[PDB]
């Protein structure tokens, strides 16, 4: 189908505690493949998926240099923003940055992304035309004018339409056996009695990839949300994902309820019934 | 592959 | 600006006593990123616990997976203890084999 590459950067100032901590992680679809930690001993970008290890030493030198440079700039930017917002030297603050690109199933560029947040709220983001910015407030407007003057959108557009998608395509080829797989959910249902009057049905999806899935309960063929519980999709730790959905039903009416499972790895959606 | 910036890119 | 963690404690595979497994504590939806997550065995902190690299979702909330290999038994109770600025006392979530 379509695929994506994303980098996620987090810088946190640690006032009194020393110098800011920087963490970078890279993903293709729902699979992490690199990390960099400003606190770790290696001071290198590190592999976190098997297929990225077939990149040679120049790749690791270059990605280490560039991600270190990004970390240094975000260190600068923590001091800059505390000035812009008239904040004290005392509190801890957070810069988050996400960027990346999507490709379609034939590998062609679909869209590119760059967005930054300060203390959890939108700060500045590149617009979809990859030529202009959306600034969230007056402080971000200061940054906007510096970046429009420096033609920074040209650099971002060049990367997002060029190197980003070219390397994303390369990863999908190098990691075809895992990135281009679909693992269909392994499903089952559990049944536990609350009282004489009610029971819980819990509909499970396990060992699936990618993470996108839909679990819905119906009663007599009608969608049901009352007295249901859906948990957030969660990692199993082995590269696959898990989810469940439960419903509280009157005892002896279990046959009226169906759980419906939709996932890319299923030719047709599944219906489970107790 | 991370963004390849100018030395002075992305300064707030 | 301040978001309290969602917490799920669960096994990688459905638990079978005497069979090797992985105990997971997944914390998500939180802000700021400073957090302590400990896995407990009968109230005692488990020594060797690993975690994923800090990442976040579209809405800027952070998420982390803490995990350890373990072998469930009839007797042993497991839980996850989460310490975060939004919580006046750490939240302890017990492992339920069917959640």
Residue numbers in the entry:
A (entry chain A): 1 to 274
B (entry chain C): 1 to 12
C (entry chain B): 1 to 99
Q: Could you share sentences copied from the article?
A:
MHC, also known as HLA in humans, plays a crucial role in orchestrating the immune system recognition and response to viral pathogens. Similar to HLA-A*0101, which is one of the earliest identified HLA alleles among the human population, HLA-A*2601 possesses a similar characteristic for the binding peptide and acts as a prevalent allomorph in HLA-I. In this study, we found that, compared with HLA-A*0101, HLA-A*2601 individuals exhibit distinctive features for the T cell responses to SARS-CoV-2 and influenza virus after infection and/or vaccination. Furthermore, we determined the crystal structures of the HLA-A*2601 complexed to four peptides derived from SARS-CoV-2 and human papillomavirus, with one structure of HLA-A*0101 for comparison. The overall structure of HLA-A*2601 displays the common characteristics of classic HLA-I molecules, with the extracellular region of the H chain folding into three domains.
To fully understand the specific features of peptide presentation by HLA-A*2601, we determined the four crystal structures of HLA-A*2601 complexed to SARS-CoV-2 T cell epitope peptides EVF and CVA and two peptides from HPV: DVM and YVA. For the peptides from SARS-CoV-2, EVF is a 12mer peptide with negative-charged residue E in P1 position, and it stimulates higher IFN-γ production in HLA-A*2601. Moreover, this peptide exhibits a positivity rate of 85.7% (6 of 7) within the HLA-A*2601 population. In the structure of the 12-mer EVF peptide presented by HLA-A*2601, with P2 and PΩ serving as anchor residues, whereas P5 to P9 protrude from the HLA, forming a loop available for TCR recognition. For EVF, when the original P1E mutated to oppositely charged R, it was observed that the peak intensity of in vitro refolding complexes of HLA-A*2601 decreased. When the P1E of EVF mutated to A, it led to a minor reduction. At position 62, the unique residue Arg in HLA-A*2601, along with Arg163, forms a salt bridge network with P1, thereby stabilizing P1 of the peptide. When P1 is D or E it leads to the pulling of Arg62 and Arg163 toward P1, resulting in the “close” conformation of pocket A. At this point, P1 is firmly anchored within pocket A. As one the allomorph-specific residues, Arg62 can form a tight hydrogen bond network with the either D or E of P1 of the binding peptides in the assistance of Arg163. In the structures of HLA-A*2601 complexed to EVF, CVA, and YVA, the PΩ position is occupied by Tyr, forming hydrogen bonds with residues Asn77, Tyr84, and Lys146 in the HLA.
